[PDB]
Amino acid sequence: LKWFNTLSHNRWLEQETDRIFNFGKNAVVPTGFGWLGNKGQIKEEMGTHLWITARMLHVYSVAASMGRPGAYDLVDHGIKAMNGALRDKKYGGWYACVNDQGVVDASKQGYQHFFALLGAASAVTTGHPEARKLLDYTIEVIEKYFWSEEEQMCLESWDEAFSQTEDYRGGNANMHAVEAFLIVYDVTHDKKWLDRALRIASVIIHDVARNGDYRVNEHFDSQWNPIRDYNKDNPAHRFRAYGGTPGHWIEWGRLMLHLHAALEARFETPPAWLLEDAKGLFHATIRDAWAPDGADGFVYSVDWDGKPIVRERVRWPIVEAMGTAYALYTLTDDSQYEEWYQKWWDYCIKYLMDYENGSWWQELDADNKVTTGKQDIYHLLHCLVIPRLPLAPGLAPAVAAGLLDINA
Amino acid sequence: LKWFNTLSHNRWLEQETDRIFNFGKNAVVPTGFGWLGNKGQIKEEMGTHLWITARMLHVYSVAASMGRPGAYDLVDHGIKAMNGALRDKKYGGWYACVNDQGVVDASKQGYQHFFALLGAASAVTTGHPEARKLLDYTIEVIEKYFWSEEEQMCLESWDEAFSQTEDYRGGNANMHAVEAFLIVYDVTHDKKWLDRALRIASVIIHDVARNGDYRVNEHFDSQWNPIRDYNKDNPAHRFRAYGGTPGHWIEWGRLMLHLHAALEARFETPPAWLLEDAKGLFHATIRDAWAPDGADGFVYSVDWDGKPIVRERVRWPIVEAMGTAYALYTLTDDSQYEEWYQKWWDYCIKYLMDYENGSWWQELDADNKVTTGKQDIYHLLHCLVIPRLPLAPGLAPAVAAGLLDINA
Amino acid sequence: LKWFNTLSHNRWLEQETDRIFNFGKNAVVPTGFGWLGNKGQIKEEMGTHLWITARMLHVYSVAASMGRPGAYDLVDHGIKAMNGALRDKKYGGWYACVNDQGVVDASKQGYQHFFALLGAASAVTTGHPEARKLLDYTIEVIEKYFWSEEEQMCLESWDEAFSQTEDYRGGNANMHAVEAFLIVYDVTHDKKWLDRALRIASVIIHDVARNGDYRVNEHFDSQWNPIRDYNKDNPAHRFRAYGGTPGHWIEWGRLMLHLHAALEARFETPPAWLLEDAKGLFHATIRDAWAPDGADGFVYSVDWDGKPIVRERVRWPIVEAMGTAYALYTLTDDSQYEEWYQKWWDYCIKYLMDYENGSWWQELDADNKVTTGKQDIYHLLHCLVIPRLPLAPGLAPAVAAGLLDINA
Amino acid sequence: LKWFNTLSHNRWLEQETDRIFNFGKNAVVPTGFGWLGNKGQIKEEMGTHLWITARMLHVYSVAASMGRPGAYDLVDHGIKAMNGALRDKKYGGWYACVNDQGVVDASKQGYQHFFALLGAASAVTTGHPEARKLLDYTIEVIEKYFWSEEEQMCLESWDEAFSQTEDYRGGNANMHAVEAFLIVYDVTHDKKWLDRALRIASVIIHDVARNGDYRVNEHFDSQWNPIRDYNKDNPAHRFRAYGGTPGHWIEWGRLMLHLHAALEARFETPPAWLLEDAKGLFHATIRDAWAPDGADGFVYSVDWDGKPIVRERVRWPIVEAMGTAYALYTLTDDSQYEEWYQKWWDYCIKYLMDYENGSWWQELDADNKVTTGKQDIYHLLHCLVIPRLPLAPGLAPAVAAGLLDINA
Amino acid sequence: LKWFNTLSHNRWLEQETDRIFNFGKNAVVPTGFGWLGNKGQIKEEMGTHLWITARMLHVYSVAASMGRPGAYDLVDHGIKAMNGALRDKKYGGWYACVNDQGVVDASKQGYQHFFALLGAASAVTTGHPEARKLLDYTIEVIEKYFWSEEEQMCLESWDEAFSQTEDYRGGNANMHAVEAFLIVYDVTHDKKWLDRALRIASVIIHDVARNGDYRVNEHFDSQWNPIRDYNKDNPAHRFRAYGGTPGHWIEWGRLMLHLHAALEARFETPPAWLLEDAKGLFHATIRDAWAPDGADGFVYSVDWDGKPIVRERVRWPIVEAMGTAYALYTLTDDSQYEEWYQKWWDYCIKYLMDYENGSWWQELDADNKVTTGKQDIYHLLHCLVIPRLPLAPGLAPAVAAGLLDINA
Questions:
Q1: Long-range CB contacts (within 8 A, 24+) of E260-263
Q2: Most buried residue, C311, C363, D88, D194, by CB count within 10 Å?
């Protein structure tokens, strides 16, 4: 019944957190962080990705501030890799993927860059001597090719040379921008980062999503008009999945509570829609995606009527669900959020956690059985560490500030 | 020996704080806050000053967050005043002094308007519904008439209608700008107010002061050139007194350590000179001003050779010295600072504190005897509340944030 | 903004509490506790009432557990008084009032007898060797003559010989029954006391009061039919005042939250009507009684249309209101409650608290000006100690359990 | 029932402590500390006593460590006095009493010299730059004239020139020696001080008082043989009163518990008899001296059969009893000691504490009415501060070490 | 960035500590504690060493105070061994090494005897019934054969029958004398041991080392004259290595700060050279031994110009360095010290820590690679437990006093 803000529960979280930090260290390769498989081994053919490398940089900055030996070393390894092979020393920014043999993907993807921004901002909290310089440059690359001052939104991607930008606008790239902007804000207080976050949110969530029963529209045209039918011919395709992706909805919910908390931290009454929409997104994720087909677990994608499409149970959606449950609980003090949190934890240790091979499974059947791959651990901190910290400042900043278990 | 961060000492501090909060409540007048005498009674002839009203608003905002019944009411009263008689509903800003019958001094003085800015920013920490609006307005007045974007420094004064500004630039008005700016920053988290703080300081302190044996130059010309000879003719005129007034020097010291803390708070390695010049100003104050004439206490004014001019022991100087002692202790951990703090407290209860008539005496003999008036209580928080709080965020913000005694 | 559960605010409350404990100790007389006046002097003309003596036994039982010397002495004195002259050693129970010259009022009043029960129960929390025996006896009297087993409610009063009970039924006697039952429950855990309390509440509040816009109906005939007309022609009369007396409404609200908490404390989900009706009574009190006539303060009585009658501002109503704000804040975390709490504290120090003569003024005219009796300090604990403790166990029990400031 | 180690009780103790510190402040005279009267006025005819000056030095060293401004100044004043007129700069040691004109009593009294030792040892805990030098000189005087290496006990007194020691031996001088030795041990860790303490206690308490039903024999001859009849011709006379002085008995009790604690603090199992005899003395004190004549309170002197002689209730005996009660509770956790403590506090606030004129009354008649006088406050710390500290290290050392309320 | 005094870091340290305690329990052999191998197995051929046995007694006294089941049993085993086969029941003291068949090495080694003194003093903190007896006897052996009252320094060794002492004096034997003396002082509170410690250090460090650029000279002739060339014929032989061994330098640093803390605790201002030289020894160790040959880590020995000799990276040197970093940080609050600590922890988990086979590796190449014995864990408490305790009292005493994590 009572788990939040209790030391007994938090100790359990910390212990699982260590099991996860330990699992991730096996990803260290020369050009950064490799792709970990079902037993924690590296999948060379996957090479070294930008998004995975930036996330880890962020992940071990948190671990370093938690006083773990070797984490800081991984942070140094992350900074050097962001100044290495992955960095396009010719056109700027970072390549999408590279291996020891050279570049595998030279495309410049927005979401992957905002993750670079997050990594840098979090790396700054560790005080690493090269971190602040990495963030400065990253902020430059962002403002030069990913943040549109005319649209006041984020772009999707570009070719290596940054010659032509894709005629597509997405909710995922802008969501990770809001995520990164929050931390850049915490380590700069340059007002623009927060306003830009609130701006991205008022558009994709308070405007579009909210008028559609809180089902986030992911695809927009270059003029920022919803492209509802996008990918309607490739329904099961995960990448840019047709319809709405509920996991994203709930993640968006939390981010807005962090926006809410940031404003409150500076004695500023936050706009009421942040909390309203956060709940809206939270309830809509449970309404359409939680156990809608005869079994527990969150389905991956849903159509515009609330009906499931991809019913596989992928790991991160429920992980984000827990993080959001905690955020809502923190601002509402409403027990229903803690009940969902506890319920989701029971599900996780029942079907997702793998104590035999390490970490948690990537995804399961619509019947929650293992069937395809665990290259990420970054999301896990949102249900393992976030519940031990206030909502402001952000994740890394708060740990670095010694706020862990502050409310317990 | 050990007082800082001890609950026993802090309880003592809190109890005297209440004695003083109580003393000040009697200043309440229809147009704002009156001028209190040696027995806690209002001196009607003095009328209602803008600087006293603004300071009192600041003061009770702190008391309000400390949970003192009545305080919030006085805050409301202060905001009503800042919106009423004191305000120039024609040219903007506030009149220097007014009364029940009309305006007494329509001039618009910088330092007084900066206290207006501090008062509104502090009031914002109480959450009073009319506070934020008051601050925004004050921000307008300040950026239009007192903060010079071209000079990148603060002006001194304007006539009522703001037709022409005074061909003078003073360290005091700009010092209270830094003071107010730090709080505005705490309740807006906007980078500029802090950038403006450092700027003001790099000039008046790191440039001029540091090159003048840390004796702060007070009077300047419209081109910010030091007018060392200012008032060398006129007598011991307190108003823009000739030479250097040490109390201000030690005050600048603390202000820069608050600036230091703010930068550290947002994970930014602060300039090494904030702390260097802090120590410098501290030492210089003791050097020329502490017991230089056969008796304990701080002299009021000193000349460019460091020789006392006005030898009267005014209250606020030693009060600020204590505050600065605490700040330097917090950032250096050097025991000499704590020794001075205790040394100064003993002096205060022995010669300044008036348990008989209330509050503290405002000024003493060169021999520490009461002679020729207790209109302020704002300074006292610097030696009664600041020692119970971290250096970041500022006074009012920290109390409202529940940081009182956090380090004890 | 934030006072509840903050050590700074609670320190203020404690210090005021000590000022009140000191004031009431001047009421000690040979037969029990006297009636204190405006300067804290005994008004021996008033004699020694049963209710005042029972209340003081309760008050100093709290003071005693708070570690105040002398307090226990008053508790001992209170018990001896309950076993002495005040006790009807012929027919049982206690006279309504006596003096050094004999019995002044031999009537057996219910509410006073229930206060006797509260007194005995609280005294038991001190461990005084004679308290338990006093409570056991008090139980007999109560179950024998004041808790109608047939009516499942409380009787009003009896003649000295308990031969005929009054043909009237009131809310006040039954409300103080609830108040006392909660504590007996805390010191016995005999299910009946809590059940009886719920029963009383369900009838007077959930059934009657709730159907009449949460305006509590005080007068009933022996068949428990409300006598809405009762005392009509005598409006200004306060004994069994005509219409509704809001002060009682809000008090019932708190008591019901204590029942709520009592049930949660034994891992039982409480019925929702408790919290629902508490909010109803609270809002109902603000609606009709708070500043309804162009001046702050709670009116004493109101009619069935919510229109005022006795517009004097009596002390206990706003004191109880504050206690209820705290109880409701504690169960909903809704800040509106804390705001009222602070607003009322500012009102109390501005017009009620008397630092010059001691304690608080007991009454003000409709314009909040002091009229001219300062007996009772019992109510004050509800706004001074209650806010520093959980809602379960009850007041005296909680302090004896060492829970003072447990949530701060 | 529960006061020991509760913050509520300890806050009460501290507040009363401040009321007492303030009182003693007026004793400051050019030669040290004067003799305070019933209104806190200096009774000039009494002059400046060594024992009073030494005690006050000890007292304000505690106050200084508690963070009280002005206290350290008094410590400084005390040290200068111990190096001024009171000090026999010709023969060594200190005159018993002096005034502004000269030496009033040149005798070298042992109990007063041990208070000098206590005062210095306590002053050392404040860090005062002259404290150590004072302690070292005091130690030299002690070993030179008051600690008999041949007798392995303390001497009584000498003439001004230290050429003729008194042909008498007393327990009071040896008892204060133990009290001082404990603190010297705390600020030096030279085993000899604690070993001498044990030796003194083993002889006077364990080898003599214990065989006398725990009635401490105070008068001995030079061969340390008891002089039971000492002054049988003038019982009523205070100085070296006939028979036993119970206040001393219970005080020896506490001192042996601090000794017990000191041994525990160095991981050494303390002899069983220290605790056994402490219980012994405490019991005997209640037996013969507590309310044995029809009214509460402790009588001053007792006959060898346990019969009262001097029945006036002096202040310190009960003050010390409370301290010992705390010490025995701490080592036995037996509630009976806490009950006595509370009972005695009730007695104190009722008969001894004087809130009207200041401090506490020094003496009351057999019926507990103020008689005839407030020259001491040193004993009061034993019931006001001792209870907030562990038994090791001693009073001044523990406060200086930041142990106030450590167990609360 | 921030690890010291953070619960999150200390939890990491406690958990590794348990892993370490678990590894050492396997060393139990009938005659005391055996020599453990790289897989935690007993190397029977090495037999039972006095130094190892004494170190484990010490180690498990700490584990026992930390509440670990089994620990106290190992403490008991340790005491039995020190009273058994190891003890020379004919000439006194202990044999340097023995096995089940008899005595392997009958020489009486000073540094091993001082470890016996440390083990006994540490054992005393557990309260074991036979500890004090062992400590008492060890004291007698030490004062009779290893502490020279004429030299005011420690002797090196003797033959079995104690007929002739070695014509040599070493800094190592005297260093562990200071280490043991500190703990003897904590369990005897006899300044004699702290005086002897302060004396040892004033000679070995403030005298010699400080004048040789803080390069500690360890080989001396019987007249205490440095033997700079000692073992130049065996420049790669770790035993009494030629030149300087930095590991020892930094260790002396920490020891002197414990000595500093010890003096502070008894309110005695400590000699400034303790902290000054500690800083000096710290800097010297980094200057000459940290990464001086193209790879991270500390070299084992260095010549008189600071040039490396033995370049293998032995375990204990860096472990001691982290301990000293903590102590310096604790007394200077200077960030560089924490940065080194963190930097060194990252190195340890990277190359030294062996989760695969248990404990940590004992030695590495100049390239930090493992090669061709894990007989110790005593050193590990200096980087695992010391950072969770204050500097006074010492390690075992402080844990037994409940100070673990007191500053976090």
A1: E260/E331, E260/E391, E261/E390, E261/E391, E261/E392, E262/E182, E262/E185, E262/E186, E262/E194, E262/E392, E262/E393, E263/E194
A2: D194
Q: Which of B64, B124, B70, B76 is nearest to C344 (CA)?
A: B70
Cis bond upstream, residue C393 (ω within 30):
yes
D abuts A (3+ Cβ pairs < 8 Å) = no
Peptide bond before residue B317 is cis, with ω within 30 degrees of 0:
no
Rounded Cα distance, B259 and B254, in Å: 9
Q: What's the rounded Cα separation, in Å, for the pair C324 and C319?
A: 9
Domain boundaries defined on chain C? 1-408
Query: By C-alpha distance, which of E56, E63, E66, E65 is closest to E24?
Result: E56
Query: Which residues of chain D make contact with C64, given a CB cutoff of 8 A?
Result: 1
* D268–E132 CB contact, under 8 Å: yes
Experimental method: X-ray
Residue whose C-alpha is closest to residue B135's, from B147, B117, B157: B117
> B41 and B360 in contact (C-beta within 8 Å)?
no
Looking only at Cα atoms, what is the longest distance across chain B?
56
Burial group, residue B368, by CB count within 10 angstroms (0-12, 13-18, 19+): middle
- Overall residue count recorded for chain D in this entry: 408
Residues in chain C with CB shorter than 8 Å from the CB of B63 are none
Judge whether A379 is annotated as a binding position.
yes
What tokens does E76 get? 């008991």
Terminal Cα distance for chain E, rounded: 15
* A248 counts as catalytic: yes
What residues contact A359, with CB distance under 8 A and at least 6 apart? Answer: A19, A20, A23, A36, A40, A374, A377, A380
Residue ranges of the alpha helices (H) in A301-380? Answer: 315-332, 335-347
Contact criterion met (CB below 8 Å) for D157 and D108: yes
> Which residues are CB-contacts of A83 (< 8 A; sequence separation ≥ 6)?
A130, A134
Angle at A231 between CA A230 and CA A237, to 5 degrees: 140
Instruction: Report yes or no: B379 and B319 within 8 Å, Cβ to Cβ.
Output: yes
Residue E154: beta bridge partners? Answer: E147
Number of other CB atoms surrounding residue C132 within 10 Å? 16
Catalytic residue among E77, E248, E260, E382: E248
Q: What is the DSSP letter of D297?
A: S
CA distance E167 to E221: 7
Pairing status of strand B108-109 against strand B157-158: antiparallel
d(CA C215, CA C245): 8
Instruction: Give the C-alpha separation, D157 to D179, whole Å.
Output: 18
CA-nearest residue to C353 within chain B is B69
Q: What H or E segment, with its residue span, contains residue B234? A: none
Side-chain-side CA neighbours of residue C152 (13 Å): 11
Residues 35-64 of C with CB under 8 A from D: 64
Is E379 annotated as catalytic? yes
- A neighbour chains, 3+ CB pairs within 8 Å: B, E
**In this complex, is the C-beta atom of B272 within 8 Å of any C-beta atom belonging to chain D?**
no
A7 Cβ under 8 Å from any chain E Cβ: no
Architecture per CATH, domain C1-408, reads as Alpha/alpha barrel (1.50)
Q: How far is CA B56 from CA B20, B26, B36, B119, B384, in A?
A: 12, 11, 12, 8, 16
**Packing angle between helix B171-186 and helix B110-124, nearest 10 degrees?**
20
